[PDB]
Design a protein around this ligand. Structure first.
Ligand SMILES: CCCCC/C=C/C/C=C/C/C=C\C/C=C\CCCC(=O)O[C@H](COC(=O)CCCCCCCCCCCCCCCCC)COP(=O)(O)O[C@@H]1[C@H](O)[C@H](O)[C@@H](OP(=O)(O)O)[C@H](OP(=O)(O)O)[C@H]1O
Ligand SMILES: CC(C)CCC[C@@H](C)[C@H]1CC[C@H]2[C@@H]3CC=C4C[C@@H](OC(=O)CCC(=O)O)CC[C@]4(C)[C@H]3CC[C@]12C
Ligand SMILES: COc1ccccc1-n1nc(C2CC(C)(C)OC(C)(C)C2)cc1-c1ccc(Cl)cc1
Ligand SMILES: CCCCCCCCCCCCCCCC
Ligand SMILES: CCCCCCCCCCCCCCCC
Ligand SMILES: CCCCCCCCCCCCCCCC
Ligand SMILES: CCCCCCCCCCCCCCCC
Ligand SMILES: CCCCCCCCCCCCCCCC
Ligand SMILES: CCCCCCCCCCCCCCCC
Ligand SMILES: CCCCCCCCCCCCCCCC
Ligand SMILES: CCCCCCCCCCCCCCCC
Ligand SMILES: [Ca+2]
Lengths: 163, 286, 49, 188, 162, 76, 97
C-alpha cells in the first residue's frame, strides 16, 4: 500500500539501475547470439538461448513492479505510464509475459516485439534520451517534405498507371 | 515486382525510382515494351523532382534548422565558454614561455659561477629549445614525407630487392621516430608532452606501429596497417600557411564535442541493431 | 558496386590464391570505417563548408 | 553535359553494342541524345563504373565503322572527372538555391514577413482589432504603420526621420513620388 | 633625480618565484639589450618607509650620470606604496588581465607555491583594482617579445626626450 | 507487404543518417568559423588599442554568417 | 585567350595533317576532340555566365583546405587497402580451382 510505497523509492539506488543495465546488455547479447535455420531446424545452442528467456522476463517484470509500486500508475499526473519511455518498457515486459500463453498465432508476431529491448538502453541512460531528442527535433520540419514526396509519388504513380 | 499493374505496384516502383536505385532498368523496360522516344519524359522529370529537388529541399530545411538552433541561449553560452577556454589557454602558453626564458637565463647565470644536476638541466633546456626550433620542424616533416614514399610504392609483385629495402626502412623509421619522441618528451616533460593532442596521436601511432612490428614478427602473414598513419604528420605543413587557425579550430570543436559525437554514432548503432534483429525475425533463415 | 568489392574483400584467402566464401569475414570493418569517414563524414563536411 | 557528351561521342562513339556489356542498345554513345542519357545515368550513380569498364581500351568495334580497335583508357579520367564535376556543380546549384531562400528557411513565426503582408491583403474583405488579436491612406499607410509597429528602426519624430532617410536611399525606379507620397501617410 | 629610475611591479608579490622570474626575464632583456647604457643593482632596503636611507643617495649618483638605472627592489608590490616618497621612479606595470591564467600559472610553476596560491592571487587582485594612471607603463602583452619591444620603445622615447 | 521493412529502413535511414552527420559537420564547422573570426577580430582590436596606448605614453561575410548575426540579435 | 588560341591551333594543325594517307589516326582524332572547347568560348562573352563560373571557382577555393586533408586521408586508406588486399583479388572461372 502506502507504507511500502515509501520504501521502493529508495530502492532506485544506482547499483540497482546499473544491474538493470547489465541485464539489458545481457539480453542484447543473447538476441545477437541467435542463428536461424530454414524449415524448423534449430541449432544446438539456440535451445540454451531459448531457456535463458524466463530470467530476463522475470527481471524486467520485477523492475516494472518496483517502478509501479514506488511511483503511481497513471493517476498522480506523474507516474510510470505517463512517461514516454516507461510506456515502451511496459509494452516490452507485458508482451513478453503474454508470449507465455501457449497459443499458435502469438509466436510469429509476439516474439518480434522483443527486438525493442535494445531501446531500453536509451530508456535507461538519460544522456542518450537528450541526444535522441536532439536528433528528432530537426526532423519535424521534414514532415512537409514527406507530404510533398508522397504527393509527387502519387502523381507519378497515377501517370505510370495511365501509360 | 517492378510493374505498373496496380496503384500499389506503381507507388512501389515510383518510390524505388525516387531513391535512384534501379531507375534505369525500369526505364529500359519501357523502352522495350513501347518505343524509346517518349519514355525519358516520364523518368528524367521524375528523377529531377523526386531525388534532386527533394534533396535540395531537405538540405535547405535542415541547414535552416541548424542555423536557428545554433543561435539559442544555451548553445551560445557553450560556444562562448569554449572561446573563453581557448583564449585562456593561449595566454597561459605565452606566459609559460616567458617563465621558461626566465628559467633559462637564470640557470645560465648560476652556471656562470649537484654539478650533474646543473649539467642535466642545461642539457634539458638545450633540447627543449632545439625541439621547438624551426629546423626540427622541417627535418621531422622531411622524415615523415620520406616515410610515406616508402609505403606508397608497395605494390603487388614488387622486386625482392624492394621488399627487403622497405622492411629495413620500416625499422629505421621506427627508430628515428622513437628517438624524436624521446627527445621531445625529455625536453618538454611528459606532463607537457601530452598537452597537445597531436602528440597524443603520434605516441599512439608509434605504439601501434611497435605492436604491429611485434605481431608481424610472431605471425608474418597479417598486417594491421597502423604504420601508415604516420602520414598524418604531413598535415602540419599547414602550420607555415595562413590556414592554420581554421583547421586547428575545427579540430578543437571536434575534440570538444567528442562526447556528443560518440553518443550520436551510438544511437545509429542502436537503430541498426534494432533493424538487424527485426530483419532476423522477419527474414531469418528464409 | 561497393557490396561486390566487400564480397571480394572478405572472400580473399592469400596472395596468388583464389577466393573462399566466408573467409576473412572480419575485413568488413575496413568498409564500415570507410563509409563512416568518406561517404558520411567528409561529404557532409564539404556540403557544410 | 554538352562538353562531356561530345567528348564521349567522339571518343567512345564506335563501341560495338553488346547486351552482355554496359554499352547496349540502351546505354551507348552513338547519338547526342543517347550520350546525354548515359551521362544523366552516370550522374545518378547507376553502375557508372561498369560503363567505364566497358568503355576501356581494346573493345570490339562497330561493324559499320572503319576502325578496328575502339574505346580507350581515357575512360578512367573521363568518368572520374565527370562524377567529380557533376557532383560539385550540382552541389553549388543546391547551395545557391538554399541561400537564395535563407531568410525563409530560418524564419520565425513571431517575427513578421511577407506572410503578414499577404494576410493583411486578405483582411481587405474594425477587423484590424480582430487581427491585432490574431497577429503574430487605405492599404499603404496602414501597411507602413504596421511595419513600423512590428520592427523599430521625440521617438516618433526620430522614426519619421529614419523613414525619410530610407525613402531617400531607396527612391524607386522612375517614380515621381511613390515612397515620398507614402511618407506623408507613413508619418502618423 | 636627473632621471626617473626604472621600477618593476604588478604581476604578484616580489620574492615569489613567479613574479621574480617574470621580472628577471624582462630585467635580463633590458640589461643585455641596452649594454653600456643601463646600470644594474639589487635593492633590499624598504624605500616605501623612507640603513633605510643609506641607498637613496646611491640611487641619485647612478641617476646623476644621465643613464638609465634599474631598481631591483625586493619589497615593492604596489605603486602607491611609494607615492609618498620623493624618489619617484617609473611605475612599470607587468599586467596580466585574467586571474585564471595567473592561478593556472601558479599551479604550473612547481609544487612549493601551490599552497601559497591564495594569498598571492589575492594581493595580485588587490593591485589589480588600482587605477591605471598610478602606473607609468602598462605591459598587457602575453608574448615576451611584444612586451619587451613596447617597453624598449618607450625607453627610446625617454632617451630621446633626455 | 514485407516491403514495408525496406521502405521504412531506406526512408528512416537515408534521412536520419543525413540529419546526424550533417548536424555534426555544420555545428563543428560553424564553431571553427566563429572561433577563427573572433580570434582575428580580437587580434586587431588588441593591436589597435596597444598602438593607441603605447603612442599615448610616449607622447565581406557569407549569408550563413550575416543571418547568424541577425538571429543573435533577435534572440538577444 | 590561351583557350581560344589552342582551339584555333588545334583546328589548323588538324587541317594541315589532312594527308588522307592514314599514317596517324589517333593524333588527328585527338585534334578533332580538341574542338569540344568551342562552346566554352561563350563564358568569357556572357558576363553573367562568367559570374557564375567565378562563384563556382570561389566555392572550390573555399573548400580547397579540406580537399587536401581529404586526399591525404584517402591516400592513407588506399595504402592500408593495398597492404590488406594486394594480390588476393585473383580467381578462376572454375570455382573448384
Ligand atoms: C568525427 C566524426 C566521425 C568519425 C570520422 C573521423 C574523420 C576524421 C577527420 C577529423 C579531423 C580531420 C580534419 C582536420 C585536419 C587537422 C587540422 C590540422 C592539424 C592540427 O590542427 O593539429 C592537431 C590535429 O590533431 C589530430 O588529431 C590529427 C588529425 C587526425 C584526426 C583523426 C584521428 C582519429 C579520429 C577519431 C579519434 C590538433 O591541433 P593541436 O592543438 O594539437 O596543435 C598543436 C597546438 O597548436 C600547439 O599550440 C602547438 O605547439 P606550439 O606551436 O609550440 O605553440 C603544437 O605544435 P608542436 O606539437 O609541434 O609542439 C601543435 O601540434
Ligand atoms: C612524396 C610523398 C607525398 C609520397 C607520395 C608518393 C606518390 C604520390 C607517388 C610516389 C611513389 C609513386 C609510385 C612508385 C611506384 C609505383 C609502382 C608502379 O607499378 C608498376 O610498375 C606496375 C606493375 C608492373 O609493371 O609490374 C605503379 C605506380 C606506382 C604505384 C607509383 C605511383 C605514384 C606514387 C605512389
Ligand atoms: C567527397 O565528395 C565526393 C567525392 C567523390 C565523389 C563525389 C563526391 N561528392 N558527392 C556529393 C553528393 C551528391 C549530391 C546529390 C550532389 O548531393 C551532395 C550530398 C551535396 C553531394 C558531393 C561531392 C563533392 C563535394 C566536394 C567536392 Cl570538391 C567534390 C565532390
Ligand atoms: C517523451 C519522449 C518519448 C519517447 C519514446 C520513444 C518511443 C519508442 C519508440 C518505438 C519504436
Ligand atoms: C540535363 C539532363 C539531360 C538529359 C536528356 C536525355 C534525353 C535522352 C533521350 C534519348 C531517347 C531518344 C530521343 C528521341 C527523341
Ligand atoms: C504513347 C506514349 C508512350 C509512353 C509515353 C510516356 C510519357 C509520359 C507523360 C509525360 C510525363 C510528364 C511528367 C509531369 C511533370 C513534368
Ligand atoms: C554507425 C555505424 C555502425 C555500424 C557498425 C556495425 C556495422 C557492421 C559490422 C559488421 C561486423 C562483422 C564482424 C564479423 C565477426 C564474425
Ligand atoms: C583483423 C585485422 C584487420 C582489421 C581490419 C581493419 C583494419 C583497419 C582499421 C581502421 C584503420 C584506419 C582508421 C582510420 C584513420 C585514418
Ligand atoms: C587510345 C588511348 C590509349 C591510352 C592513351 C591515353 C592515356 C590517358 C590520357 C589521359 C589524359 C588526361 C588529361 C587530358 C585533359 C586534362
Ligand atoms: C508466410 C508469410 C506470408 C506473409 C508475409 C507478409 C509479410 C509480413 C509482414 C512484414 C511487415 C514488416 C513491418 C516492418 C515495420 C517497421
Ligand atoms: C585540355 C582539355 C582536353 C580535352 C580533350 C581530352 C583529351 C582527348 C581524348 C584523348 C584520348 C584519345 C587518345
Ligand atoms: Ca546505386
Amino acid at each position: 500500500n502506502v507504507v511500502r510505497k515509501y520504501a521502493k523509492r529508495i530502492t532506485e539506488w544506482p547499483p540497482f539501475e546499473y544491474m538493470i543495465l547489465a541485464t539489458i546488455i545481457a539480453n542484447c547479447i543473447v538476441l545477437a547470439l541467435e542463428q536461424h535455420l530454414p524449415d524448423g531446424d534449430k541449432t544446438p545452442m539456440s535451445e540454451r538461448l531459448d531457456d535463458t528467456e524466463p530470467y530476463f522476463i522475470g527481471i524486467f517484470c520485477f523492475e516494472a513492479g518496483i517502478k509501479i509500486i514506488a511511483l503511481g500508475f497513471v493517476f498522480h499526473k506523474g507516474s510510470y505510464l505517463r512517461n514516454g519511455w516507461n510506456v515502451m518498457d511496459f509494452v516490452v515486459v507485458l508482451t513478453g509475459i503474454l508470449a507465455t500463453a501457449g497459443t499458435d498465432f502469438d509466436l510469429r508476431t509476439l516474439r518480434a516485439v522483443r527486438v525493442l529491448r535494445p531501446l531500453k538502453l536509451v530508456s535507461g541512460i538519460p544522456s542518450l534520451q537528450v541526444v535522441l531528442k536532439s536528433i528528432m527535433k530537426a526532423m519535424v520540419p521534414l514532415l512537409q517534405i514527406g507530404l510533398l514526396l508522397f504527393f509527387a509519388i502519387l502523381m507519378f504513380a497515377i501517370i505510370g498507371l495511365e501509360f | 515486382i517492378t510493374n505498373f499493374d496496380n496503384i500499389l505496384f506503381a507507388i512501389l516502383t515510383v518510390f524505388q525510382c525516387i531513391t535512384m536505385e534501379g531507375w534505369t532498368d525500369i526505364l529500359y523496360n519501357t523502352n522495350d515494351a513501347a518505343g524509346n522516344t517518349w519514355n525519358w519524359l516520364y523518368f528524367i522529370p521524375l528523377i529531377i523532382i523526386g531525388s534532386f529537388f527533394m534533396l535540395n529541399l531537405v538540405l535547405g530545411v535542415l541547414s535552416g534548422e541548424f542555423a536557428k538552433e545554433r543561435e539559442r541561449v544555451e548553445n551560445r553560452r557553450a560556444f562562448l565558454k569554449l572561446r573563453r577556454q581557448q583564449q585562456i589557454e593561449r595566454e597561459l602558453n605565452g606566459y609559460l614561455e616567458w617563465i621558461f626564458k626566465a628559467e633559462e637565463v637564470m640557470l645560465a647565470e648560476e652556471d656562470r659561477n649537484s654539478y650533474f644536476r646543473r649539467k642535466e638541466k642545461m642539457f634539458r633546456f638545450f633540447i627543449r629549445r632545439m625541439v621547438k626550433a624551426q629546423s626540427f620542424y622541417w627535418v621531422v616533416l622531411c622524415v615523415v614525407a620520406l616515410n610515406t614514399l616508402c609505403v606508397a610504392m608497395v605494390h603487388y609483385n614488387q622486386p625482392r630487392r624492394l621488399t627487403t629495402t622497405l622492411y629495413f626502412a620500416e625499422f629505421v623509421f621506427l627508430g628515428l621516430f622513437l628517438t624524436e619522441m624521446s627527445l621531445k618528451m625529455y625536453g618538454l616533460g611528459p606532463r607537457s608532452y601530452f598537452r597537445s593532442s597531436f602528440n597524443c596521436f603520434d605516441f599512439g601511432v608509434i605504439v601501434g606501429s611497435v605492436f604491429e612490428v611485434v605481431w608481424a614478427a610472431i605471425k608474418p602473414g597479417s598486417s594491421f596497417g597502423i604504420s601508415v598513419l604516420r602520414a598524418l604528420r604531413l598535415l602540419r605543413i599547414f602550420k607555415v600557411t595562413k590556414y592554420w587557425s581554421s583547421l586547428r579550430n575545427l579540430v578543437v570543436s571536434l575534440l570538444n564535442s567528442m562526447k556528443s559525437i560518440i553518443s550520436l554514432l551510438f544511437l545509429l548503432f542502436l537503430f541498426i541493431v534494432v533493424f538487424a534483429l527485426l530483419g532476423m525475425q522477419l527474414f531469418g533463415g528464409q | 558496386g561497393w557490396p561486390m568489392v566487400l564480397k571480394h574483400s572478405v572472400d580473399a584467402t592469400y596472395e596468388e590464391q583464389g577466393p573462399s566464401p566466408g573467409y576473412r569475414m572480419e575485413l568488413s570493418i575496413f568498409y564500415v570505417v570507410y563509409f563512416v569517414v568518406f561517404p558520411f563524414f567528409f561529404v557532409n563536411i564539404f556540403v557544410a563548408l | 553535359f554538352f562538353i562531356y557528351a561530345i567528348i564521349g561521342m567522339q571518343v567512345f562513339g564506335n563501341i560495338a553494342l553488346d547486351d552482355d556489356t554496359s554499352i547496349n542498345r540502351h546505354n551507348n554513345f552513338r547519338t547526342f541524345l543517347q550520350a546525354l542519357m548515359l551521362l544523366f545515368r552516370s550522374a545518378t550513380g547507376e553502375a557508372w563504373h561498369e560503363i567505364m569498364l566497358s568503355c576501356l581500351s581494346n573493345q570490339a568495334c562497330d561493324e559499320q565503322a572503319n576502325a578496328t580497335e575502339c574505346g580507350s583508357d581515357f575512360a578512367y579520367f573521363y568518368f572520374v572527372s565527370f562524377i567529380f564535376l557533376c557532383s560539385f556543380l550540382m552541389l553549388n546549384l543546391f547551395v545557391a538555391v538554399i541561400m537564395d531562400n535563407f531568410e525563409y528557411l530560418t524564419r520565425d513565426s513571431s517575427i513578421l514577413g511577407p506572410h503578414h503582408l499577404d494576410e493583411f491583403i486578405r483582411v481587405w474583405a474594425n477587423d484590424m482589432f480582430e487581427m491585432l488579436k490574431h497577429m503574430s491612406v487605405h492599404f499603404t499607410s496602414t501597411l507602413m504603420a504596421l511595419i513600423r509597429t512590428a520592427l523599430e528602426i521625440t521617438k516618433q519624430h526620430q522614426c519619421d526621420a529614419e523613414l525619410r532617410k530610407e525613402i531617400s536611399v531607396v527612391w524607386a525606379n522612375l517614380p515621381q513620388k511613390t515612397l515620398d507620397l507614402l511618407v506623408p501617410p507613413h508619418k502618423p | 633625480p636627473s632621471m626617473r629610475p626604472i621600477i618593476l611591479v604588478g604581476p604578484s608579490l616580489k620574492g615569489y618565484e613567479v613574479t621574480d622570474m617574470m621580472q628577471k626575464a624582462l630585467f635580463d632583456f633590458l640589461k643585455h639589450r641596452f649594454d653600456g647604457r643601463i646600470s644594474i643593482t639589487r635593492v633590499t632596503a624598504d624605500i616605501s618607509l623612507a640603513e633605510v636611507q643609506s641607498e637613496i643617495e646611491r640611487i641619485f649618483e647612478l641617476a646623476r650620470t644621465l643613464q638609465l638605472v634599474a631598481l631591483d627592489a625586493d619589497t615593492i608590490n604596489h605603486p602607491a606604496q611609494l607615492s609618498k616618497t620623493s624618489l619617484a621612479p617609473i611605475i612599470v606595470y607587468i599586467k596580466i588581465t585574467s586571474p585564471k591564467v595567473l592561478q593556472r600559472l601558479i599551479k604550473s610553476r612547481g609544487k612549493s607555491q601551490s599552497k601559497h596560491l591564495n594569498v598571492q592571487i589575492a594581493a595580485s587582485e588587490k593591485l589589480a583594482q588600482c587605477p591605471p594612471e598610478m602606473f607609468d607603463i602598462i605591459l598587457d602583452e602575453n608574448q615576451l617579445e611584444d612586451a619587451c619591444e613596447h617597453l624598449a620603445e618607450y625607453l627610446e622615447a625617454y632617451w630621446k626626450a633626455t | 507487404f514485407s516491403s514495408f521493412y525496406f521502405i521504412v529502413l531506406t526512408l528512416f535511414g537515408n534521412y536520419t543518417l543525413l540529419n546526424v552527420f550533417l548536424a555534426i559537420a555544420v555545428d563543428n564547422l560553424a564553431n571553427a568559423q566563429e572561433l577563427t573570426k573572433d580570434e582575428e577580430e580580437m587580434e586587431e582590436a588588441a593591436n589597435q588599442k596597444l598602438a593607441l596606448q603605447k603612442a599615448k605614453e610616449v607622447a565581406a561575410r557569407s549569408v550563413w554568417e550575416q543571418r547568424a548575426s541577425q538571429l543573435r540579435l533577435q534572440n538577444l | 585567350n590561351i583557350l581560344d588560341f589552342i582551339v584555333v591551333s588545334g583546328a589548323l594543325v588538324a587541317f594541315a595533317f589532312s594527308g588522307s594517307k592514314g599514317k596517324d589516326i589517333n593524333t588527328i582524332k585527338s585534334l578533332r576532340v580538341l574542338r569540344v572547347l568551342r562552346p566554352l568560348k561563350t563564358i568569357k562573352r556572357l558576363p553573367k555566365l562568367k559570374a557564375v563560373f567565378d562563384c563556382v571557382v570561389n566555392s572550390l577555393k573555399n573548400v580547397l583546405n579540406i580537399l587536401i586533408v581529404y586526399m591525404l586521408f584517402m591516400f592513407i586508406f588506399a595504402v592500408i587497402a593495398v597492404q590488406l588486399f594486394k594480390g588476393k583479388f585473383f580467381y578462376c572461372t572454375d570455382e573448384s580451382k
